Design a binder for these strands. Structure first.
Ligand SMILES: [Mg+2]
Ligand SMILES: [Mg+2]
Ligand SMILES: [Mg+2]
Ligand SMILES: [Mg+2]
Lengths: 256, 226, 190, 251, 213, 107, 457, 180, 40
RNA sequence: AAAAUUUUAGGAAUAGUUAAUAAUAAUUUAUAAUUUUGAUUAGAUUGUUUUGUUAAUGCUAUUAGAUGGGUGUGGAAAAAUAAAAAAAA
């Protein structure tokens, strides 16, 4: 009586059920708008997906833009942690320490034998790619999820110097994965989605934490604005958490 | 649709038939399925002139002033019995008289044994409801020396068209189980002297001469003078 | 036969050779207006009906007919008329809904000239990109809500000024100074 | 009529025009109506070629816990008469039920007894059918039933476990319709048989000097009839056949 | 059938490829929510609302749309009918059958289904609440039934609800349960007015798989 | 991510979704608190129907029974008219008293 | 001007082979599949879809003419991406088949050699998942409301939930050809070539390869020997190339085709086929070095064995001399039936062999030809109720009936058979009906409908 | 399926039913009356145009003198003429592919044209309707029945494909030297 | 229509139609003949 | 499911109400929706191949037929006199 007789959002045909079934044999009931609920609402993001053989092996090193000291980002993420922990303190193991915040430009697997040839060669190619690029001012607002809501990150908006990043990345992508064959978890002809990972659930953690980060935590910060940052520093990092208190850094390039 | 008459041929509406298919034409109405039916109106229709000059009572008239001479009661019972057989005999009227409620006997309806039509029903079992003359009756259908695999509810068991023939050989006690009679092609080796086939799938009967005379005397080939 | 005179007629049932079989509708009837109301009291606030009212649509003089040929059909090949529209975004007060003002064309064959009219649409932008004052491409689609049949297909021109204006916490566009016209005199001082 | 595409007409939650879901009640005769013609086919299979779980040495034993995730659907044959433990015994003496086992008892082993066994907790069923004497089928040597003493001590039993009030699907009988040849008629010509020399071929049709005896003259039926069974779409007997062929219906 | 093993085997061979670069997501479109027609149609996830001539790489399905069947007693005017209602979830690939019960309980919108405890079962065999869908080989195509507490009592006249056609409905039970909701005493607009199928619909014998006459 | 796909038919929000990009205008508190209210519907619901089944079953009774009462029980061109007062204006004064005007929206 | 993909080329080459026109396949080859490669270690395996799909930048949209923006789905655009799965080996195989079919040895030797070499020394390409459009993804249904198997009290109705009738025709039980390993595909390719040899033989001599229409059926054609030689050399070439590897793959389809070639072209009695197949299998168990445990002949192979027996005993019916029947010169029914009996013993022994209608048909036919007069009993016990049949059964069965002692038995048996036809949904065929009609003076059995006759006159 | 049936113009099945070829014209004085051959549905509405599939032609039921042709001493040509326009591509489409129905009067017409055999309703009341008995028919059939393959091929040529390829056009269509 | 002759099986009923279509065997034979002709 | 075309000489506000959520909410969330580019009520009026005049852009006609729900049958409500549609031999 307060709206349409048949609300338009409720008109749904399921074509993944056989024809004739719903007319005679039985009726099928489901809450159908959990599935139809879109990629903007859920906060999912489609990352470059790995081929199965690459999907098998752990990633070892990654490219990163290092966040400078005195960031808008780091500050606001600290504020966000405060708020989240005051709401639910079950988040505490999920959250990444503000010390480890960095922009992830791509991920890669390096085998341990060819290690030095690869790090030297990579470092060199990287330095050539970024030779001409001056520092990058990028904008961060919004949250998103990788790997079925297990990884919770801060989006990099394509409103700014981001454009340049995309060419820049796509060049190293075509060198590191194209030229010297290296395992980039995706195709070298495809571009990686840059992100700042905030909360994460590792395999070991998953038992006590659960299989997905409940959206009730970060729902309100989903579109929150973390601000602008200029970035001069590119790293190639191996992931060791006890060597310096920051991800162990195998290579570096200065944008100037 | 599944089984048309003469394939689809549409040149007249009547060319199709009185039903397009054996199967029900709308799915929402299953009883429209093609059966073999029976003239229920005439065959129920029992004769009420048999009950003339009788003086029946009712069931719930138990009153002392109400009931009558034992002689009157007897001719009343006989009148009622004659009233119930007045059309033909219902299965349940035949079965109560036979040994073991007539298990094993072959019940044929009148029209099943005349012409090239040959069919009967071997009785598997019977449920008498409190009222006789009604009930449920199950059995095997045997059509032209070919028999059903499993038993089935006998249709139109209540309509009084039925005859049978009592044989002691076919009688089964309620303890045992009525066997299905053998289909003559399979279980029993086909024999000509034991059983001869009336009609077969492509056969049909020759013209009886009186019908021919009549049809020509109709269409005006053979003359007919007043 | 419509080409034969009043006196030339013989049979009214058929056309002898060919031509158009025509029914004469009587155009001159001297139809009149009945006056049921006093000139003082007419039972409508905005408009008054004192004479015979011309009726129909496309039967209406001077004829105004749909013009397929304009900017929109100039740029697009449309499967169905109105399947594509280019317009400006006017207002977003509704989540995932962009209102769009669009122009279309009318032709007056009497004067042999065109007019542009304008019409508003509700378009569905999932993910909420559209800022007031965007130039957008818009398409026909599945029925979405009571009034939304259109979705935002592409942003042709975004509003850079408006976006930077939002980023600073301000409204995309300043709110219009006066609203709709009134027939009163509002005396509001200081 | 064909089944229509999808239901957009009525709300799903309410479900509106739906053929009722058929459910098999074990208290009625109807149960056996469903189960019987399967059993016969099953036994037939067991008479020709082996099937694995058909023959058990002894009664299956399971814990209370795993009772209902192991048993239901299980069907196995035993040599003697022993009734499964913790099962209340019901004799099936009602004739309407007994009736459906007719074909199975005449053309396969004679049925001595039928038993409906219900678990004390009442959620499980066992249909137990005791056969007497040897098969009226021939039994193959390599066949499953050849491993049984009750066939080929003459009594033996079939046991079938099922849940009550379920559709006649999840009593699992339809897996058994694998069809193997009875090799009894050709056993005559194998190199193993010594009666193969008593065989003689007919290669050529014999000269015939007489035509088949002509059928008795046709009597046209005297009673009223319901009209052409062709036009009424009634198959030849109301029994079997196609409506195009009107054979054996009156005229 | 043939499809299932053709695509299974295809996936399994695709995973054993030593050399594959990985797909380019600019060349692998998603699906549209925007297409002609009024109705919103949900399809297979391998399928799209547009025409895509090319066969895309086989993907493992992380959300498996299970169907779980229940028995309902639907009131039709003549009396009660026992019919079937499917509940459809999307259950994550590696989920536990306990969790499947939980997802199923949340998704049903009908007041007449989940009242007591129910056990999931396949072809009459119970499933362990403990173990994974992986072990039981549960796929979309797999047939999953659901069995309530009192369902093995339904052959009696007690648990099976009582129709006001043949049974007293008293001031005891006028205030309780589906009877109360139904409003037996006719109103002017006739109350909730249920579907009706007549008595002679199936003939003298009710609906069956086997032809009984 | 500003352009739509011509052959696919998918909008710009779709190809942006696929390239893993997000264009979104900065939101005021309105849209933020609306969205953040809507995101959580299913968690609230799961908690409700786990922890409190009787209340749920009550509401469901009302809905289910409602579906049989009411104006239209089935969806036909008449019932499934998105704008009822608009497509039937000829009913509005006399027969249909629910609506007092034929137009509530752009069209 | 639509550029055919690899799949399309396959289809058209199938049409070419079956037509036996080489001159089509040659032009088709030359035009389209030339540059078609195989897959090597350096190749990347199924190539990702690379196409952009078509969009417009706002400048493209506004400034271009109308036609440059017009996208109709055009096959040519994705042709690259239909070919991304490398079905090449199929094309090469088909092309071998054509060059053989058109009677040219050098070209055939070329294609088949290329193919062989690549199959041995190059990786197995990743198969394409089932095409959504050609074959449809199965949609979920409950199977609950279904006519039960016993639904009709007169017969066994097959049902959507399960099949009770049994297989009418034996199927080979192999996955679609693209799912094979490279070695497996080598084997498959040889069996394919043999099949084409057979087909070409039947197109050159349709009279001799049709069962019992002419006495010519009982004798080898000249040119059969050169043919069988070709087949011999081919198979020994396959054993020469593939080593111990053959121990690990399915030879079933290959065997059945081999057997059918030595049954049809060269004509070998059933015993000769069983012998041949056993020698072949011994060969396959010996080349692989192991303890044996030979795989038994699968159902299809036995189908070829039995059809071998039926070929053995076959009669040319109704000579114009009003003479009964002509038989293969040097025919012994006793021996034939001996071997058939212990062969069916063998088959029914093995639990993994599924019976079908056609196998039974070969048996029955051999029974009729042998003058056993048990044909009936076998048919009624093992076939009638539990299978769906041709009317071919009733054809050879009729020939059996015709030979009984008195006339009345003949008549009554025939009439009964027709009743069978009406009961079990056999639409008794025109061939059978003619066979019955021919004796109408003797048996007086009417075969035609009333309406059919009327219309006919 | 109408609660109160429209009594005067009943039909068979739901409307609109299978298309039927009808003759219809507005009623007038007999001197001017023409008819229309029309493929339309089974259930008509007030104006016949609402359900009208195709327009097959005009038929004028007035014998006419032929003033179009020169006066011809030939006996037969100076019988009066009856004029009709048939659209036979649409007719063969509708009748053949779409499987129409036919009223009787149009049937008589199209019989005169040579498109159809004379109808069921055209009766010389001189001859009676024939008799039948199956044994005589059987003797005639056994007397004359053609070969199976001949008959199968005739059914092939009449029902399925007519135009076939002689070996010649094969040889002329198969590619020559550079791609052969 | 379906022709109902006077020698069809008369139904004696006051609650319904006076004549049930049921055929004298003659009528059946006749009908069969006519219908053969139209089959032609 | 939509897009176009829509009348009154002198002109003001309209409303079971928009959009998101969803098989939610007689009190879900929100800075909502229609209008002076003329709305809603109210008058008149049966809407986009039919006429008349005329050398002609015009002027001047065109009938008729779809009026809500309330055991919802039916493929589709078009279902309570008023044919001129052959309606299962
Ligand atoms: Mg149909
Ligand atoms: Mg609208
Ligand atoms: Mg009004
Ligand atoms: Mg009313």
């Amino acid at each position: 009586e307060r709206g349409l007789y048949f609300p338009i959002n409720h008109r749904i045909v399921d074509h993944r059920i056989a024809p004739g079934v719903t007319v005679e044999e039985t009726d099928v009931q489901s809450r159908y708008r959990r599935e139809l609920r879109t990629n903007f609402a859920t906060g999912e993001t489609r990352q470059t997906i790995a081929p199965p053989w690459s999907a098998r092996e752990r990633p070892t090193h990654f490219f990163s833009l290092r966040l400078p000291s005195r960031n808008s980002v780091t500050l606001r993420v600290k504020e966000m942690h405060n708020h989240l922990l005051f709401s639910h303190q079950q988040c505490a193991p999920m959250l990444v320490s503000p010390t480890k915040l960095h922009i992830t430009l791509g991920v890669m697997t390096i085998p341990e034998n060819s290690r030095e040839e690869l790090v030297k060669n990579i470092q060199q190619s990287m330095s050539e790619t970024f030779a001409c690029v001056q520092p990058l001012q990028l904008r961060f607002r919004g949250l998103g999820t990788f790997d079925f809501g297990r990884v919770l990150f801060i989006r990099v908006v394509p409103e700014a110097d981001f454009g340049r990043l995309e060419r820049a990345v796509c060049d190293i992508r075509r060198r590191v994965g194209g030229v010297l064959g290296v395992d980039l978890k995706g195709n070298p002809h495809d571009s990686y989605v840059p992100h700042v990972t905030v909360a994460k659930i590792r395999p070991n953690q998953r038992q006590q934490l659960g299989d997905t980060i409940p959206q009730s935590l970060w729902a309100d910060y989903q579109h929150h604005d973390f601000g602008d940052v200029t970035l001069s520093t590119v790293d190639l990092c191996r992931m060791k958490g006890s060597p310096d208190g920051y991800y162990h850094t195998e290579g570096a390039v200065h944008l100037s | 649709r599944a089984d048309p008459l003469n394939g689809g041929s549409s040149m007249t509406l009547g060319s199709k038939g009185s039903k397009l298919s054996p199967e029900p034409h709308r799915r929402r109405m299953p009883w429209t399925a093609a059966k073999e039916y029976v003239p229920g109106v005439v065959l129920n229709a029992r004769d009420k002139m048999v009950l003339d000059g009788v003086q029946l009572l009712d069931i719930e008239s138990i009153d002392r002033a109400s009931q009558l001479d034992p002689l009157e009661v007897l001719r009343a019972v006989v009148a009622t019995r004659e009233y119930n057989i007045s059309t033909g005999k219902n299965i349940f009227q035949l079965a109560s008289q036979a040994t073991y409620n007539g298990r094993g006997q072959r019940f044929y309806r009148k029209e099943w044994q005349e012409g090239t039509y040959d069919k009967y029903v071997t009785l598997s079992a019977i449920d008498f409801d409190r009222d006789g003359n009604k009930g449920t009756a199950y059995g095997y259908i045997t059509f032209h020396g070919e028999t059903t695999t499993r038993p089935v509810q006998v249709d139109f068991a209540d309509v009084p068209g039925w005859y049978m023939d009592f044989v002691e050989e076919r009688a089964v006690p309620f303890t045992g189980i009525v066997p299905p009679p053998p289909s003559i092609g399979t279980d029993v080796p086909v024999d000509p002297h034991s059983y001869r086939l009336k009609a077969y799938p492509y056969y049909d009967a020759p013209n009886p001469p009186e019908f021919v005379e009549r049809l020509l005397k109709d269409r005006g080939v053979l003359p007919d003078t007043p | 036969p419509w080409w034969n005179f009043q006196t030339e007629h013989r049979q009214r049932c058929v056309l002898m050779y060919g031509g158009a079989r025509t029914k004469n509708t009587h155009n001159a009837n001297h139809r009149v207006f009945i006056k049921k109301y006093k000139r003082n009291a007419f039972p409508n606030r905005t408009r008054h009906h004192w004479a015979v009212s011309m009726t129909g649509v496309l039967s209406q003089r001077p004829r105004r007919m749909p013009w397929p040929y304009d900017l929109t059909s100039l740029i697009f090949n449309q499967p169905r008329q109105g399947s594509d529209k280019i317009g400006y975004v006017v207002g977003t007060s509704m989540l995932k809904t962009a209102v769009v003002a669009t122009n279309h064309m009318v032709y007056y064959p009497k004067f042999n000239q065109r007019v542009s009219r304008t019409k508003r649409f509700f378009a569905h932008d999932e993910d909420l990109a559209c800022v007031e004052g965007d130039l957008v491409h818009i398409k026909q689609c599945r029925k979405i809500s009571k009034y939304k049949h259109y979705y935002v297909f592409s942003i042709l021109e975004p509003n850079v000024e408006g976006r930077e204006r939002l980023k600073l916490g301000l409204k995309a566009v300043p709110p219009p100074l006066f609203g709709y016209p009134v027939s009163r005199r509002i005396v509001k001082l200081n | 009529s064909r089944r229509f595409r999808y239901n957009t007409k009525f709300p799903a939650l309410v479900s509106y025009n739906k053929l009722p879901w058929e459910v098999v009640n074990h208290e009625t005769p109807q149960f056996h109506m469903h189960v019987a013609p399967h059993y016969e086919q099953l036994l037939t299979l067991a008479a020709s070629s082996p099937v694995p779980h058909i023959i058990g040495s002894k009664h299956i034993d399971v814990p209370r816990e795993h009772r209902l995730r192991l048993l239901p659907g299980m069907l196995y044959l035993l040599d003697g008469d022993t009734l499964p433990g913790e099962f209340t015994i019901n004799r099936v003496l009602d004739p309407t039920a007994l009736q459906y086992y007719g074909r199975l008892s005449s053309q396969i082993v004679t049925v001595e007894a039928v038993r409906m066994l219900v678990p004390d907790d009442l959620r499980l069923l066992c249909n137990c059918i005791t056969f007497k004497g040897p098969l009226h089928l021939p039994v193959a040597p390599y066949a499953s039933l050849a491993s049984l003493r009750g066939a080929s001590s003459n009594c033996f039993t079939l046991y079938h476990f099922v849940r009550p009030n379920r559709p006649p699907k999840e009593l699992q009988l339809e897996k058994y319709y694998i069809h193997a040849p009875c090799v009894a008629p050709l056993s005559e010509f194998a190199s193993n048989s010594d009666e193969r020399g008593n065989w003689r071929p007919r290669l050529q049709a014999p000269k015939r000097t007489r035509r088949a005896t002509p059928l008795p003259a046709y009597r046209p039926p005297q009673s009223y009839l319901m009209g052409l069974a062709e036009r009424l779409a009634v198959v030849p007997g109301g029994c079997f056949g196609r409506r195009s062929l009107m054979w054996g219906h009156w005229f | 059938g043939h499809y299932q093993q053709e695509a299974f085997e295809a996936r399994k061979r695709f995973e054993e490829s030593t050399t594959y670069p990985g797909p380019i997501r600019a060349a692998t479109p998603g699906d549209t929510r925007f297409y002609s027609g009024s109705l919103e149609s949900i399809l297979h996830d391998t399928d799209r609302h547009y025409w895509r001539a090319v066969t895309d790489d086989p993907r493992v399905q992380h959300l498996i749309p299970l169907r779980i069947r229940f028995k309902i007693f639907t009131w039709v005017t003549s009396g009660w009918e026992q019919r079937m209602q499917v509940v459809q979830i999307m259950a994550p690939k590696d989920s536990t059958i306990a969790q499947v019960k939980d997802l199923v309980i949340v998704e049903n919108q009908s007041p007449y289904l989940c009242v007591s405890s129910f056990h999931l079962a396949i072809d009459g065999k119970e499933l362990d609440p403990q173990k994974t869908l992986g072990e039981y080989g549960i796929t979309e195509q797999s047939q999953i039934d659901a069995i309530e507490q009192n369902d093995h009592l339904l052959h009696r006249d007690d648990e099976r609800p009582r129709d006001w056609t043949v049974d007293e409905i008293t001031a005891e039970d006028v205030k309780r349960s589906p009877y109360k909701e139904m409003e037996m005493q006719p109103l002017q607009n006739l109350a909730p007015r249920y579907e009706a199928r007549p008595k002679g619909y199936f003939g003298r014998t009710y609906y069956s798989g086997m032809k009984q006459s | 991510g500003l352009n739509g796909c011509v052959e696919t038919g998918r909008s710009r929000s779709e190809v942006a979704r696929d390239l893993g990009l997000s264009y979104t205008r900065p939101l005021h508190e309105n849209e933020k608190k609306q969205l953040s209210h809507q995101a959580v519907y299913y968690e609230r619901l799961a908690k409700f129907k786990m922890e409190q089944p009787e209340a749920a079953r009550a509401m469901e009774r009302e809905r289910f029974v409602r579906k049989f009462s009411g104006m239209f029980v089935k969806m036909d061109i008449r019932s499934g008219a998105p704008d009822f007062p608009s497509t039937y204006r000829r009913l509005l004064g006399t027969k249909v008293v629910r609506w007092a005007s034929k137009r509530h929206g752009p069209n | 001007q639509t550029w055919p993909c690899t799949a399309t080329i396959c289809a058209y080459l199938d049409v070419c082979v079956e037509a036996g026109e080489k001159t089509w396949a040659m032009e088709a080859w030359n035009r389209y599949c030339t540059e078609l490669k195989f897959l090597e270690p350096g190749e990347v395996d199924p190539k990702p879809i690379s196409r952009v799909p078509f969009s417009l930048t706002r400048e493209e949209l506004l400034y271009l003419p109308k036609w440059k923006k017009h996208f109709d789905h055009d096959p040519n655009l994705d042709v690259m991406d239909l070919n991304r799965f490398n079905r090449t080996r199929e094309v090469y195989l088909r092309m071998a088949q054509v060059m053989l079919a058109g009677g040219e040895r050098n070209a055939f030797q070329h294609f088949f050699t290329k193919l062989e070499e690549a199959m041995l020394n190059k990786p197995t390409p990743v198969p394409e998942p089932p095409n959504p459009h050609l074959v449809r993804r199965p949609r979920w249904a409950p199977y609950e409301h279904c006519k039960s198997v016993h639904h009709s009290p007169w017969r066994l109705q097959n049902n959507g939930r399960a099949l009770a009738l049994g297989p009418p025709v034996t199927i080979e039980d192999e996955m679609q050809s693209r799912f094979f390993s490279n070695d497996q595909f080598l084997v498959h390719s040889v069996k394919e070539v043999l099949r084409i040899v057979l087909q070409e033989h039947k197109r050159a001599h349709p009279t001799e390869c049709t069962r019992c229409k002419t006495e010519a059926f009982f004798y080898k054609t000249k040119d059969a020997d050169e043919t069988l030689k070709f087949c011999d050399d081919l198979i020994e070439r396959l054993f020469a190339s593939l080593g111990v590897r053959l121990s690990n793959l399915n030879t079933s389809s290959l065997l059945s085709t081999i057997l059918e070639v030595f049954r049809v072209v060269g004509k070998e009695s059933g015993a000769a086929l069983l012998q041949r197949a056993n020698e072949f299998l011994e060969r396959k168990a010996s080349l692989g070095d192991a303890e044996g445990s030979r795989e038994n002949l699968t159902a299809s192979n036995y189908l070829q064995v039995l059809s071998g027996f039926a070929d053995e005993s076959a009669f040319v019916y109704n000579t114009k001399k009003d003479g009964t029947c002509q038989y293969k010169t040097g025919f012994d029914p006793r021996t034939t039936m001996r071997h058939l009996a212990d062969v069916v013993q063998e088959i029914a022994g093995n639990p993994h062999v599924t019976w079908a209608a056609d196998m039974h048909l070969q048996v029955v036919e051999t029974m009729v030809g042998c003058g056993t007069m048990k044909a009936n009993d076998y048919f009624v016990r093992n076939v009638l109720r539990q299978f769906s049949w041709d009317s071919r059964f009733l054809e050879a069965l009729y020939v059996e009936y015709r030979r009984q002692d008195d006339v009345d038995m003949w008549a009554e048996l025939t009439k009964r058979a027709l009743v069978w036809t009406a009961r079990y949904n056999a639409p008794a065929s025109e061939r059978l009906r003619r066979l019955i009609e021919d004796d109408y003076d003797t048996i007086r059995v009417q075969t035609r409908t009333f309406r059919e006759l009327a219309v006919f006159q | 399926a109408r609660a109160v049936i429209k009594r005067r113009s009943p039909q068979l099945w739901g409307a609109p039913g299978a298309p039927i070829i009808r003759m219809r014209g507005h009623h007038v004085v007999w001197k001017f009356q023409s008819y229309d051959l029309v493929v339309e549905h089974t259930h008509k509405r007030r104006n016949s145009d609402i359900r009208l599939l195709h327009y097959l032609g005009k038929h004028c039921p007035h014998p006419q003198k032929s003033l179009w042709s020169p006066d011809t001493p030939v006996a037969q040509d100076r019988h009066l003429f009856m004029l009709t326009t048939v659209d036979i591509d649409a007719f063969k489409y509708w009748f053949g592919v779409k499987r129409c129905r036919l009223s009787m009067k149009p049937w008589a017409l199209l019989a005169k044209a040579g498109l159809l055999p004379p109808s069921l309703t055209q009766n010389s009341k001189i001859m009676p309707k024939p008799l039948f008995d199956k044994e005589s028919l059987m003797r005639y059939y056994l007397a004359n029945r053609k070969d199976e393959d001949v008959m199968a091929r005739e059914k092939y040529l009449n029902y399925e494909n007519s135009m076939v390829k002689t070996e010649e056009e094969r040889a002329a269509e198969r590619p020559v030297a550079p791609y052969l | 229509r379906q022709i109902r002759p006077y020698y069809n099986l008369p139904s004696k009923s006051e609650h319904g139609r006076k004549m049930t279509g049921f055929l004298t065997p003659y009528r059946h034979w006749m009908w069969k003949q006519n219908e053969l002709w139209r089959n032609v």
